Design a protein around this ligand. Sequence first.
Ligand SMILES: Nc1ccccc1-n1ncc(C(=O)O)c1C(F)(F)F
Ligand SMILES: Nc1ccccc1-n1ncc(C(=O)O)c1C(F)(F)F
Ligand SMILES: Nc1ccccc1-n1ncc(C(=O)O)c1C(F)(F)F
Ligand SMILES: Nc1ccccc1-n1ncc(C(=O)O)c1C(F)(F)F
Lengths: 157, 157, 154, 154, 157, 157
Amino acid sequence: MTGAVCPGSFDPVTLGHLDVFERAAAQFDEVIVAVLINPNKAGMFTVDERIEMIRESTADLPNLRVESGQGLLVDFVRERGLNAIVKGLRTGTDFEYELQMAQMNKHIAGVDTFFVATAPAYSFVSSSLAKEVATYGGDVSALLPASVHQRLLGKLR
Amino acid sequence: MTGAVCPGSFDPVTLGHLDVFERAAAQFDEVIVAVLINPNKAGMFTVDERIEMIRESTADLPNLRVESGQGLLVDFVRERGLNAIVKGLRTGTDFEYELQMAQMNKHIAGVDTFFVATAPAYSFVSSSLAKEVATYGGDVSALLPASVHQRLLGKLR
Amino acid sequence: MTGAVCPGSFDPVTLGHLDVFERAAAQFDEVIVAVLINAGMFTVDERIEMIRESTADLPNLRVESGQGLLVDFVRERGLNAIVKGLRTGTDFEYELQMAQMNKHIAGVDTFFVATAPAYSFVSSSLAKEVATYGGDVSALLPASVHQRLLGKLR
Amino acid sequence: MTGAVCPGSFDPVTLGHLDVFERAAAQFDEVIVAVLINAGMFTVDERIEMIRESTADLPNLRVESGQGLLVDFVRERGLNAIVKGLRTGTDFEYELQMAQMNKHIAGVDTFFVATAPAYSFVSSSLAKEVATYGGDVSALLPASVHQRLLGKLR
Amino acid sequence: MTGAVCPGSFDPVTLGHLDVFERAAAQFDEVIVAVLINPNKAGMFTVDERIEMIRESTADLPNLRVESGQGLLVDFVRERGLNAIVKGLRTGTDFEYELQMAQMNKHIAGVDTFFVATAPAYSFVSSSLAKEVATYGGDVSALLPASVHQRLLGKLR
Amino acid sequence: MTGAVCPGSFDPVTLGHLDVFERAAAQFDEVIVAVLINPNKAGMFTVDERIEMIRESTADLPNLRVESGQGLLVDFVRERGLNAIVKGLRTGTDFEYELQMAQMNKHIAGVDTFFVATAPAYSFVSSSLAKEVATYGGDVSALLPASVHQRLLGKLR
Ligand SMILES: Nc1ccccc1-n1ncc(C(=O)O)c1C(F)(F)F
Ligand SMILES: Nc1ccccc1-n1ncc(C(=O)O)c1C(F)(F)F
Ligand SMILES: Nc1ccccc1-n1ncc(C(=O)O)c1C(F)(F)F
Ligand SMILES: Nc1ccccc1-n1ncc(C(=O)O)c1C(F)(F)F
């Protein structure tokens, strides 16, 4: 059985992330989405809220599961019998930064990273920019899953 | 039942390519190396020679096979009942160019592309630069598998 | 009386190009599309025709063929601005060199716009290549252009 | 009636910025410099003042402070174009994301211009940093700004 | 009488840095490693510790010396009667950022900057990423000189 | 004695090249400008014309000499008792390409490469773009040494 981990803060999950999840679940026997908890930045949504939002949006992916993770990612991956990470990239400068992390993760733990190019429609979407825009009344409903948008309006109120 | 195609001209295969093959073979049930031939431009090596050099250096990968082709890569992929391409990247400029072809390939045929970061040792190795340096007498033995180096020197002489 | 020139080979014009034309047309009183003679699929007249067909709804745009220095083309028509679309940061680096050169020699400025997201991967070159091998590029090209491209391949 | 907004923190405005203002002013009937309140050296009023002082020769330019979404600022003034300067391909990538977002949510377009070559290395941040340690940045800043910067450091 | 300054925070020095030091020392009559301290931000290591770690791994470079400083790098350079800075680069984004500082430094003080490309093996090594990975238990022994690794582990414990 | 080689086609030498030559001659005891002859592309100026133009523009650099070179650059460098190359860069994408060549040259012959950032005024100038512009009556006199411009007008007639 093949498998990969899709890591991120997902605060909140976007349609870009979801596209990556779907494409991973289509090519690996199992996919684990790792929602990374950071004690430093606490973000807009709690880890449990983030997990629930992802589960709602991935309800039709039976071979994908969602968990919280903390600390060194390659430990999270290897603890679950896997040794691949799958991540989306939206630009060359994204690649450069992620490349050093991928080479580091391969060096320290033998864990591989597979990158997928963003769907063209979501090349400009990020969690941070979506939150920023929404905070000032901008409409980001076309960039987020249905599950997220309603919950986002709520947090803003 | 998972699988991916690793495409290239492989004229000749490099250690960088072999690294990608090994990493693909580790993460997918089957891997097909697609030796893509330009029927209008002979390279340095014939199709038979390219395939032999790849086979000799992949003998320890039981789930990898090598086949040639031409025309649209996505047709090669789909006619084998697969839907994924695996390719290596070295730079951010690599990524921009490949992103465009990856997005085109997904658009016209639904085929996805997964990129892996080059092993650091091979980030400067290319088929073209290896051929160029060897043409002028530089030592490229450490960048090419054994199956390649002296065949290359033979071509040049 | 504002104006800009949108240059390119446009062989053929894509929906990515048309997007840039419309955006230029929305912000400048006068837009001239400059079809540059440089070697490819469509003749200059054919390219001009495909563009005119696809830009009928833009009253302040016209299409002309051009040769020689782009800056001469621009200045001989009383303008001093170029409008061009970009997809990547590598696009910017290459175009930046030409933009600074053009400003240096003739005082002609260049305004760049970011590609629409949907057309990130579309280029004349790649569309021709894919169509040549039977790939469907109908969603990447103006309706008129697409039929004409089929015709060339036959 | 064409127009564009040139946004930034301008803390302080540099000769690189002023170059972009002049170039925008040359191609659009109306330019509004938007001084964004976000945390730094000069107050909003001070930044506005330094810009007005340095743009007296541009009759079709005015300077206003802004808060909230840039697209709201732009649309509430009847415009739908942003003009911004770029130095590198990395600049383009970051700005491209915001430009496509801004177009998506409000239909506001963005036009980028390449920096003048002489100002490739100038930024408000680096000029302040260097001046703070006694480096001479007088050739990188408008005459007025430079005196005012000295004053802040004293 | 030729000479160059190799600047950095070196918190801690990496094998990538050491490679740059060695290459500078090979091409200039004297090299000064400038340990630049932010008087307002303690790093992980004190100035004395940073200098010791660099000295212990450069003992075989007779024409290299190590000194700390703060403020404008160009003043450090000129007060030693020198006019050149030598720095390593890994990426094109590295280059854009350093180009801006190099052009500023030439403008204000006439000091030139020479960049060298990272050794391929170290292209993913940074002081910050090494500290981050070690903080969470990853093995970074092969990216840091002997003079550094266990001191780092000691800091973390 | 320290030294470096400054390689290029220099067809014709530009003020950007000259800035690099001056900065190299200021930091190394000797500099050799290697005018690379290519049998494929024959260019606008003969090798001897290119050498003469460079000598005129570098008349006040007594520690810089100009020679023609052919074949593998690292052989040219090592044959002259040197093991450094100095080259200018005008952008990050220039760096990426040159980086692979620098890593290759270091690998095959132990020859180092030092890069210098372009003077801001010449960031847009190249031999090719200068020739192209001049061919159609554009004025590139501010971008080329005095020696070149007159000779360029002549070739165009
Ligand atoms: N936008 C996007 C599209 C495809 C794949 C990934 C992304 N992506 N990458 C990082 C992030 C983030 O904001 O955290 C995202 C996005 F949020 F999903 F858009
Ligand atoms: N060098 C390299 C390393 C990892 C994956 C791929 C490669 N790669 N990439 C492009 C090319 C090329 O020849 O064009 C190669 C290489 F050839 F395998 F080395
Ligand atoms: N990694 C590296 C390799 C060669 C030259 C320099 C470095 N380098 N570059 C930046 C940095 C950094 O720590 O920020 C380093 C490293 F730290 F030495 F590794
Ligand atoms: N333009 C420039 C500026 C500083 C250093 C180098 C250059 N450079 N680099 C390559 C080339 C070339 O055209 O062959 C040049 C230039 F031609 F000098 F501008």
